[PDB]
Automatic annotation (TrEMBL):
Location(s), subcellular: Cytoplasm
Keywords linked to the UniProt accession: Cytoplasm, Heme, Iron, Metal-binding, Monooxygenase, Oxidoreductase
Descriptive protein name: Cytochrome P450 MT2
Record organism: Mycobacterium tuberculosis
Cofactor or coenzyme needed: heme
Amino acid sequence: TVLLEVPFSARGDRIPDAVAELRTREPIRKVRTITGAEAWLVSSYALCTQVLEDRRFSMKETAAAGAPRLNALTVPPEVVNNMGNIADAGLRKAVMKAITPKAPGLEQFLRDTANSLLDNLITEGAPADLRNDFADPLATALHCKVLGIPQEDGPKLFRSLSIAFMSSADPIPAAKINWDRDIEYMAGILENPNITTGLMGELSRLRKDPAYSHVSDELFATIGVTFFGAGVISTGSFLTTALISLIQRPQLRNLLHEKPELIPAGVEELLRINLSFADGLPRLATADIQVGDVLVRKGELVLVLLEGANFDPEHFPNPGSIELDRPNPTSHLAFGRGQHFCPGSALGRRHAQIGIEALLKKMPGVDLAVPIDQLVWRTRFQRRIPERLPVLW
Ligand code: HEM
Ligand SMILES: Oc1ccc(Nc2cc(-c3ccc(O)cc3)n[nH]2)cc1
């Protein structure tokens, strides 16, 4: 028999019980990736946190030529260090202030968009597709408002993502075509005088500010492309698979409908058990570092399995159960940890909270319209998503 291969399953509605047996017997284990490279798979909360909290496990260095690779680069190699380049241009504070849910009228725009999408579904009649006709259009509309771009440009940018976020063994020619086209669009936004709000509106005025005169134009447009794609694919995928977990639990669904003030705690447990990230977080060791029973050598690839940490019984007792009263509710790794902690976590939380709350009010009796096995799980992709999520209510 051959070396164990990752990823285990494209399914995002159950964790394979091989994860628990691996975490107990071998919390750091040698695996093979889709490119044929070997990597260290880390599946325990203690070791995942160690790897994420140690910058000698470098994300930037995963882009080096000849390194062992989890998948093929779908971006220019310098875009792998996206947040490092943003921080070096002095734009980190401005970017993060622009993508908070605390902007005036942002939460109200979400609820109106969520209610409008659910009303169209109700009017068309069951069955409805909650991913393509709810969760994804909501994520797309939210990021258009956050970036400051017209809502009508959302759909054409969204359809690049099924290729842009592939997990491929080989480079993808269409990924570069979509990237170049989406960069040109974002560069025109920076030259568009009608774009004065959101992230692109702020970046536009900073581009003309003397303190940013020697920041490259490619970087301003890269921020727009990279934050739209990362945000749309992460919020849309998380909300899609969180709705499945809710629907599968009619008692939890009724409780959140009856007492909607528990929705923030519900979303935190849905984040912890979430399987949206299809691969471990890749890091390349830049030194010899002891991890558990393994001396990781310089130049080797490390994969941080988030569901291994988030389903760890040593840190979350009874990990498969949704418990709205845990003592450590936000200590999960759904947003990462350390240097590269997700910069849009607050906006991702409010997107799911508002989407769920609107769904429970409009379709309180929402349930699957097909047996759970009939869902089609997207393969070789950086997220686990069903192609369609058909429901009745
Ligand atoms: C439910 C929603 C989301 C989830 C579960 C999520 C998850 C994550 C995780 C786990 C990481 C860490 C990656 C690593 O350490 O290798 C990350 C990073 C990142 N996220 Fe999110 N994310 C979400 C929403 C968003 C949103 C709304 C945005 C922007 C609008 C965004 C933009 C980014 C960016 C740019 C990074 C790279 C950070 C860096 O390299 O320092 N994400 N995300
Ligand atoms: O129209 C589009 C939209 C997305 C992409 N693909 C793509 C990769 C990333 C990314 C984000 C963050 C990061 O740290 C590293 C890569 N964003 N978008 C291409 C064309």
